[PDB]
Design a protein around this ligand. Structure first.
Ligand code: HEM
Ligand code: HEM
Ligand code: FES
Lengths: 54, 106, 81, 49, 67, 379, 62
């Protein structure tokens, strides 16, 4: 362990945000994906009507 | 020298024709074509009756692809019916330039 | 040229849509969507996998072929002579 | 002729609040929209952090 | 003294079959070598084979056995 | 145009190369890369800068400095990896942007394509030097041969190598030069990008169906911006996860030892994408003829648009082309792993096996495909 | 009948975009002060006695 830590003094800390980011992380993704869909909603809701008087 | 195999040719044709999704999107063969110069002026010479109808199906087509839905199979295009309407116009533009192309050689 | 104005010429098409508020972000996204996932996945998997097989085969094929070829010096020539 | 046109139903993608044909849509409209925005704003707090 | 957990955990896995199984091969090598060792033969190649899976067993056990 | 605030500086009217630039309706997340590519790069510049801020290029200094970086420098550990690992991500971002082009035949646009061609060639050497900068054991030896490689020129190479060296060996000035090169070089690319883009505004993007999209367009801002934003956000974790929890995964180079010209590594490999070329490099026993291939390897991309064989651009409707298309995909990835192998006899054969296949896939098969299929539909 | 907080909220805050913007910073502030404070416990809950925070008490100021 001693050497293993020596080459990586940052290590036991570097997981803090590693943890910290993941908690944060799941929040945003759907929100966008929703808003994404929310905007796109009007797009995929289109309806065509081809009524040439023709 | 092919007679029965000629009959045997059409299956894979019909098969291969059925192996490309645009049959299942309600397209035809002609509207599939990649553009070209002959393609261009060919468009000019079309009557609207086709032309407009050419338009809508395309416009119809694209929308579906947006939503990842394939046309209900009942309504898929049929290997029995393919409209060649493009080409009888196409051969004109091909032909004429070949002259100019050649007649300007010498 | 001017991007939205002059592109094509189109007549007698009609279009209908709603405020995005008027509707839902997931109209049966789970239930109704899952089949659509499935149906089209096969159209590809027909034409997708077959090579991936080949490598992994050859991958291990050569791997083994590599191993014994190397691994064992007294394999064919054993250490009597 | 032209008037032969009609509106097909979008009730599907909708949510039930204004889904009724006889209701003032304004009743939820206040609460209706705020859901859409409450998402939008909360999205931002994270981005800011 | 303390005898270590190791030597103990050494024995528990070498107890396993493929261990002694190939350990024979070592002797299958070794004994044949003992007469024929003039020729290039050495059992090292097999020793590693012997030791490989040997400690693959020894892997999980003693790290718990240690402090 | 009355009181439009986008006129007043005309610069804002150049801005409408975006916000009203129309786009077809159906666009796959396949298309999100062009965005990402530029974004992957922006980050590069910055991080690749702050490095220099504490970095010194010197034969004695550089390593110990870089040692010192993750040691005493605030967050010297996040940053270095942000630079290196972030480099890797730029690749796979990039190739897809290629892959899209082929699989729909977007290459049909000739010049825009070509710009991409050059644009590609540029990027590699950047990383190459960027990889030498560490001055690690491999970086020394890796470039040592790859540079020595070019000596195979029959005549002018002899001087020319030592020239780019500036010496009989890899010694100091040969380092320092690269630093400048590796330093300036991205700015050049960024300029070129604005060219590559430019033509695209002329003819607009293409659509997956390989069909004229004229009839249906979209105002760019309300939508594709968003899918990009998410698309951008996709990238985050992709680096974040790797860069943070498990650094050394694609940090495959193991050499933190000082570069030793006396010592030679028992195994010699560049990093991954550098290998697949170097794999082909291993193949041919002929020194010169081999290099010739390696050159010819990529450039045929520009040739490909001469190979439009059919009356339909995209491959989504051609199974066989698609069959072919995916076939080639593996042939590369094999070589990757192959170049990831020592040169024992199956591999020896294997590369020889897989090598000629590669071009053969391109150079023979693919053109004939539509030819049949053109004839098949009776086109 | 009372409005669900949603109907209150827009009328109260989200209507004027400034306010709509204003609140954003506000909670974001209180957010982080609480947020990070939680994860570390969870973090250090996970790692017990592996850290001086736990360990160093053995020898800290003798
Ligand atoms: C396309 C963008 C870039 C590429 C392909 C690139 C290439 C590389 C690569 C592959 C490394 C090795 C990373 C490592 O060893 O950890 C590196 C390191 C470095 N790069 Fe870049 N880099 C880019 C951006 C930049 C920029 C813009 C600069 C200058 C402002 C820069 C300066 C450096 C420096 C100082 C290092 C030292 C760290 C090291 O070499 O390990 N890089 N570069
Ligand atoms: C750093 C490298 C590159 C960057 C930053 C880059 C950036 C972009 C961007 C932002 C677009 C617009 C998005 C799009 O049209 O889908 C684009 C389009 C394109 N790029 Fe590049 N690209 C790069 C490399 C390449 C290469 C190597 C090629 C080809 C050899 C290439 C060929 C194209 C093509 C054909 C398009 C248009 C595709 C279409 O509209 O269907 N790009 N590129
Ligand atoms: S020349 Fe040194 S290995 Fe080929």
């Amino acid at each position: 362990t001693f050497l293993r830590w020596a080459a990586e003094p940052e290590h036991d800390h570097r997981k803090r945000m590693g943890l910290k980011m993941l908690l944060m992380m799941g929040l945003l993704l759907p929100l966008v994906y929703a808003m994404k869909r929310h905007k796109w909603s009007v797009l995929k809701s289109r309806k065509l009507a081809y009524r040439p008087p023709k | 020298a092919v007679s029965a195999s000629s009959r045997w040719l059409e299956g894979i044709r019909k098969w291969y024709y059925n192996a490309a999704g645009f049959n299942k999107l309600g397209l035809m063969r002609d509207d599939t074509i990649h553009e070209n110069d002959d393609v261009k002026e060919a468009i000019r010479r079309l009557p609207e009756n086709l032309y407009n109808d050419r338009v809508f199906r395309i416009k119809r087509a694209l929308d579906l692809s947006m939503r990842q839905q394939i046309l209900p199979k009942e309504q898929w295009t049929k290997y029995e019916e393919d409209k060649s309407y493009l080409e009888p116009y196409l051969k004109e533009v091909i032909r004429e330039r070949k002259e100019r192309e050649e007649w300007a050689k010498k | 040229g001017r991007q939205f104005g002059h592109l094509t010429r189109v007549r007698h098409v009609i279009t209908y849509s709603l405020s995005p508020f008027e509707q839902r972000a997931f109209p049966h996204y789970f239930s109704k969507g899952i089949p659509n996932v499935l149906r089209r996945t096969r159209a590809c998997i027909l034409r997708v996998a077959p090579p991936f097989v080949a490598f992994y085969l050859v991958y291990t094929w050569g791997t083994q072929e590599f191993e014994k070829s190397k691994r064992k010096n007294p394999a064919a020539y054993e250490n009597d002579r | 002729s032209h008037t032969d046109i009609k509106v097909p139903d979008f009730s599907d993608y909708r949510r039930p609040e204004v889904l009724d044909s006889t209701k003032s849509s304004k009743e939820s409209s206040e609460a209706r929209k705020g859901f859409s925005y409450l998402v939008t704003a909360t999205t931002t707090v994270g981005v800011a952090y | 003294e303390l005898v270590d957990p190791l030597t103990t955990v050494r024995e528990q896995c070498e107890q396993l079959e493929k261990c002694v199984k190939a350990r024979e091969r070592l002797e299958l090598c070794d004994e044949r070598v003992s007469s024929r060792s003039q020729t290039e033969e050495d059992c090292t190649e097999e020793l590693l084979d012997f030791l490989h899976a040997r400690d693959h067993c020894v892997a999980h056990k003693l790290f718990n056995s240690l402090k | 145009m009355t009181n439009i605030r986008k006129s007043h500086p005309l610069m804002k009217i150049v801005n409408n190369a975006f916000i009203d630039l129309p786009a077809p309706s159906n666009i796959s997340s396949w298309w999100n890369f062009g965005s990402l590519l530029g974004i992957c790069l922006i980050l590069q510049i910055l991080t690749g800068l702050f490095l220099a801020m504490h970095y010194t290029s010197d034969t004695t200094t550089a390593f110990s400095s870089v040692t010192h970086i993750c040691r005493d420098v605030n967050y010297g550990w996040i940053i270095r990896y942000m630079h290196a690992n972030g480099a890797s991500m730029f690749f796979i971002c990039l190739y897809m942007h290629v892959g899209r082009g082929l699989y729909y035949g977007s290459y049909t646009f000739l010049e825009t394509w070509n710009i991409g061609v050059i644009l590609l060639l540029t990027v590699m050497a950047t990383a190459f030097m960027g990889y030498v900068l560490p001055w690690g054991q491999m970086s020394f030896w890796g470039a040592t041969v790859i540079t020595n490689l070019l000596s195979a020129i029959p005549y002018i190479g002899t001087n020319l190598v030592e020239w780019i060296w500036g010496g009989f060996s890899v010694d100091k000035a040969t380092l320092t030069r690269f630093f400048a090169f590796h330093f300036i070089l991205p700015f050049i690319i960024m300029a070129i990008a604005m060219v590559h883009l430019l033509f695209l505004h002329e003819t607009g993007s293409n659509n997956p169906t390989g069909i004229s999209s004229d009839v249906d367009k979209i105002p760019f801002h309300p939508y594709y911006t968003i899918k990009d934003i998410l698309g951008a956000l996709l990238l985050i974790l992709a680096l974040m996860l790797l860069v943070l929890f498990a650094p050394d995964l694609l940090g495959d180079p193991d050499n933190y030892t000082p570069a030793n010209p006396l010592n030679t590594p028992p195994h010699i490999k560049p990093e991954w994408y550098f290998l697949f070329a170097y794999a082909i490099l291993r193949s041919i026993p002929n020194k010169l003829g081999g290099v010739l291939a390696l050159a010819f390897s990529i450039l045929i991309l520009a040739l490909i648009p001469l190979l439009h064989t059919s009356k339909q651009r995209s491959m989504m409707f051609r199974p066989l082309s698609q069959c072919l298309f995916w076939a080639l995909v593996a042939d590369l990835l094999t070589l990757t792993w192959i170049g990831g192998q020592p040169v024992e006899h199956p591999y020896i054969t294997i590369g020889q096996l897989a090598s000629v296949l590669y071009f053969l896939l391109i150079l023979v098969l693919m053109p004939t495909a539509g030819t049949i299929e053109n004839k098949l539909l009776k086109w | 009948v009372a409005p669900t907080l949603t109907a209150r909220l827009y009328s109260l805050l989200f209507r004027r975009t400034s306010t709509f913007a204003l609140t954003i910073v506000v909670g974001a502030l209180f957010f982080e002060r609480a947020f990070d404070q939680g994860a570390d416990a969870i973090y250090e809950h996970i790692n017990e006695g592996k850290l001086w925070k736990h360990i160093k008490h053995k020898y800290e100021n003798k």
